[PDB]
């Protein structure tokens, strides 16, 4: 298919509070984490503290 969707919004929800953390762009490639580009800043996140959604 070589051309991934990218219509996914992923806000990195850790645990310091219930403040939604601005839906980043998903581009993960692995399993134990979640690499996510926000603007330009790429942020790998530990699975347990992330939340991805579509559309």
């Amino acid at each position: 298919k070589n051309s991934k969707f990218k219509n996914f919004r992923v806000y990195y929800r850790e645990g310091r509070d219930q403040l939604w953390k601005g839906p980043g762009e998903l581009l993960w490639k692995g399993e134990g984490a979640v690499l996510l580009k926000v603007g330009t800043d790429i942020k790998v996140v530990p699975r347990r503290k992330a939340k991805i959604i579509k559309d």
Binding site: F5, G15, I53, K54
Partner: protein, 148 residues
Amino acid sequence: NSDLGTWQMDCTHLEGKIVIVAVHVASGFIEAEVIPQETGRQTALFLLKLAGRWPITHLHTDNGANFASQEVKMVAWWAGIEHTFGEAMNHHLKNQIDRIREQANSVETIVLMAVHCMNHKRRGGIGDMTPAERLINMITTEQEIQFQ
């Protein structure tokens, strides 16, 4: 915490009844009903009922004689739910029921009626998913990852 397979089972009392509760930590999918006794048999029989429909994998509980029985041991393993022992979308369980309490007599019927209203009431906008609709958007998104 918000691992897509994470569910939490609180157990309570309401009107002299015992209300078992389970929340999908990553969304707000409340699942609950009245169990005639606070016991592993019931807690296993509930987790099982929960295991048999949602892509669950993590059950976070808060270590009590209830969710630490052999009955919940067998089920958990049998379905592959690694347990991890330790009120909000369980607090508003008692609340939202009060704004329903009349609609039907029994606590049984009333706690179920409660999860309906509870499961279908949207949040804000720009990601306006009701509890129920969002859960499916989260489960499905995992799958939408594919094995290309």
